[PDB]
Amino acid sequence: SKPKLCRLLKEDDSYGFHLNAIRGQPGSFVKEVQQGGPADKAGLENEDVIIEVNGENVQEEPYDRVVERIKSSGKHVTLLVCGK
C-alpha cells in the first residue's frame, strides 16, 4: 500500500523494468525488475502501481501510453508508485 517517490537514471538506455496491464481495469503495474538495475536500486517491486510519471497522474492511462511517457522522459524519470 505504501507510496514511493523515486527518480531513475537510465543505464544501458533502460530503466530495468517493464509494465503490464490487468484485463478489465485501467492502470500500469511494474514487472520484470532487473536485479541491480535502475528501478531495483530505487526499490521498485513487481505489482507496484504507477501513480505519477514526472508529477502527472497516469492512473487512467493505458499502460502502453505510460510506457511511451517514460520513454519520452529522456535520461531520467521521476515516478510515484504505490505498492500493493
Swiss-Prot record:
- Spell out the subunit comment: Interacts with PDZK1IP1 and ABCC2. Binds to the C-terminal region of SLC26A3. Interacts (via C-terminal PDZ domain) with SLC26A6 (via C-terminal domain). Interacts (via C-terminal PDZ domain) with SLC9A3 (via C-terminal domain). Component of a complex, composed of PDZK1, SYNGAP1, KLHL17 and NMDA receptors. Interacts (via PDZ1 domain) directly with KLHL17; the interaction is important for integrity of actin cytoskeleton structures in neurons. Forms a heterodimeric complex with NHERF1. Interacts with AKAP2, BCR, CFTR, SLCO1A1, SLC22A12, SLC22A4, SLC22A5, SLC26A6, NHERF2 and SLC17A1.
Name it.
Na(+)/H(+) exchange regulatory cofactor NHE-RF3
The UniProt family comment states: Belongs to the NHER family.
Q: What does the UniProt function comment say about this protein?
A: A scaffold protein that connects plasma membrane proteins and regulatory components, regulating their surface expression in epithelial cells apical domains. May be involved in the coordination of a diverse range of regulatory processes for ion transport and second messenger cascades. In complex with NHERF1, may cluster proteins that are functionally dependent in a mutual fashion and modulate the trafficking and the activity of the associated membrane proteins. May play a role in the cellular mechanisms associated with multidrug resistance through its interaction with ABCC2 and PDZK1IP1.
What's the record's remark on domains?
A: The PDZ 2 and 3 domains seem to be involved in the interaction with SLC26A3.
Q: What else is known?
A: Disruption of the gene was not associated with abnormal growth and development or redistribution of interacting proteins. However, a modulation of expression of selective ion channels in the kidney, as well as increased serum cholesterol levels were observed.
Please report the stretch or stretches of sequence annotated as the PDZ domain: 5-84
Highest taxon, organism lineage: Eukaryota
Q: Where in the cell is it found?
A: Membrane; Cell membrane
The organs and tissues expressing this protein are described as: Expressed in kidney, liver, small intestine. brain, lung, and testis (at protein level).
Phosphothreonine carried by residues: 78
